[PDB]
Symmetry: C4
């Protein structure tokens, strides 16, 4: 399960890495604001402090959202159940 | 399962196609910005770079969201489990 | 199951009705913009064309979101599986 | 199950408490607007009436979202099924 977590963890990193590269290049964001925007996008928070202004950016966001949501929320799912929960359970039993 | 994917795939396309037509016509968006807005709406990202200004638009968005979310997120679910996951698994075994 | 759908359907209506009343009264929205804002809130779309400006409004939105999301998304779930899906299946068999 | 509810209830409170403290301190929000922003963030509503302007804030929001969503939506899940639903069922049987 650490290896089930690891695979999704890597895949999410590669997914955010890619959004960072596209949005910094085509939409002109700083690398930090691209990563931020990528995370705010794929988690469906969506503040809209940053949004794509080019048509190439709008098109890529359509595909990025559809490809990216399933992954991101699977990692989060993994993270909650296989990492956060046991840690919580361990804090209720002094060793 | 390719046919379970195909049905939802088509249904999502028809759903976005329809939002594109309504928002381009009634709210005055370019066809590209209507599709974009439709996708950002039904995935619950919701940047708000575009939002409906007419009452007819606000009313349609209420119904579009309620009818559209279940579909869109079922496709995404299908896509992650029946397309992305196996592809991932295949990349871990050289042929 | 029509009665399982009916209960949630009513409960969602009562939930939106209430947001409409609070936001029209305390935040000063038109009744149509209050309902719209209520729907955009509880589905987690969240355009932000409208947002609460008073502290009483911000506090109520915290509680409304927490109480309202579970309901709204249960109705949508019901709607997709018990209404949309069978209708789809029926359209693939001429009578 | 009251104790399953209680644990998540506490954990959500501690999670919002922490966002309130970070956003009030680093981003300069009033304590009420920090809590509000924290709730609007972790539920993925995301109006964007408030968004982080510092790089330290953007970085923390990335981690807060990933750590916080699984918890918040588990509480909501608990709340809907173990509190709201039975209460609803009880209202359909006069004592
Ligand atoms: K979900
Ligand atoms: K959302
Ligand atoms: K959102
Ligand atoms: K949003
Ligand atoms: K927004
Ligand atoms: K805005």
């Amino acid at each position: 399960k650490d290896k089930e977590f690891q695979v999704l963890f890597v895949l999410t990193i590669l997914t955010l890495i890619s959004g960072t590269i596209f949005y910094s290049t085509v939409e002109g964001l700083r690398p930090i604001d691209a990563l931020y925007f990528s995370v705010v996008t794929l988690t469906t928070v969506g503040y809209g402090d940053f949004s794509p202004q080019t048509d190439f950016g709008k098109i890529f966001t359509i595909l990025y959202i559809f490809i990216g949501i399933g992954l991101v929320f699977g990692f989060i799912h993994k993270l909650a159940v296989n990492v956060q929960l046991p840690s919580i359970l361990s804090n209720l039993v002094p060793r």
